[PDB]
Amino acid sequence: KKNSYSYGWSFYFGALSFIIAEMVGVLAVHMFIDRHKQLT
Question: Which helix (H) or strand (E) holds 36?
Fold first, then answer.
């Protein structure tokens, strides 16, 4: 106990990549629904 292990560097690049990938995936659906609403 009291080892003070650190989650450190580029592990956070995975956590950042999650947010970036999810912000990608939501915008795709905006493009879908807007692109389909154009042909309505």
Answer: helix 11-38
